[PDB]
């Protein structure tokens, strides 16, 4: 099924899969660490629901057993929320756009030791901005994350191979020489190693936010990582 898709068709299915951007309950009258984290965890919890329904529509995903689907999402969930975050923030140098009504710079991250995760996210957004990452490439990278993060932890590999073919096809179409397609391909996939690093750090930061007073799904996804 997913294996018989062409590059354009893979791109159409992924762009059409994209989840909505959500609003936070940010009250800019209302001044806190508890409330700021409350606003972010409320948002992430609503985003987890749309992610689950987005994952279902990624070519190849529903061919997995329930168990495996559960597993890949347990590994990938914070990485996917993070690259989605970094992508919407691309055009706000110096800021993270948690939602259209919640744009924070790094000083507002002091409110919570979250400032170290903020800066990491800022520098990834900058990286994306330098490379002028495209919407089409972004949706490929996000699908590579879901599929790759928990794979080591076959059909999955065939599908990952197709998404690589699609990335290269986006880059030939964008006028890039053979040598440049492969370099861009490396740089894009090298960023995913940084994304995995920020997700391990953010997990540790989340765990210790709970272990010194979260929701259902979010707490569940957090506990998956022990």
């Amino acid at each position: 099924l997913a294996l018989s898709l062409t590059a354009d068709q893979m791109v159409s299915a992924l762009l059409d899969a994209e989840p909505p951007i959500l609003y936070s309950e940010y009250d800019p009258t209302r001044p806190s660490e508890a409330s700021m984290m409350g606003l972010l965890t409320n948002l992430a919890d609503r985003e987890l629901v749309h992610m689950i329904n987005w994952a279902k529509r990624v070519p190849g995903f529903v061919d997995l057993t329930l168990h495996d689907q559960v597993h890949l999402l347990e590994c990938a969930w914070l990485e996917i929320l993070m690259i989605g975050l970094v992508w919407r923030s691309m055009e706000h140098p110096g800021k993270l756009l948690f939602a259209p009504n919640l744009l924070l710079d790094r000083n507002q991250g002091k409110c919570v030791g979250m400032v170290e995760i903020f800066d990491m996210l800022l520098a990834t957004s900058s990286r994306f901005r330098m490379m002028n990452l495209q919407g089409e490439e972004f949706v490929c990278l996000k699908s590579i994350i879901l599929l790759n993060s928990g794979v080591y932890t076959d059909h999955i590999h065939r599908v990952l191979d197709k998404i690589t073919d699609t990335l290269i096809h986006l880059m030939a179409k964008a006028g890039l020489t053979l040598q440049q397609q492969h370099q861009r391909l490396a740089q894009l996939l090298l960023i995913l190693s940084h994304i995995r690093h920020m997700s391990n750090k953010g997990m540790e930061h989340l765990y210790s936010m709970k272990c010194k007073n979260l929701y259902g799904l979010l707490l569940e996804m957090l506990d998956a990582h022990r």
Binding site: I52, K56, L66, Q69, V70, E74, G216, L217, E220, M221
Partner: peptide
């Protein structure tokens, strides 16, 4: 829960 929603 994840199990459920999926």
């Amino acid at each position: 829960i994840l199990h459920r929603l999926l």
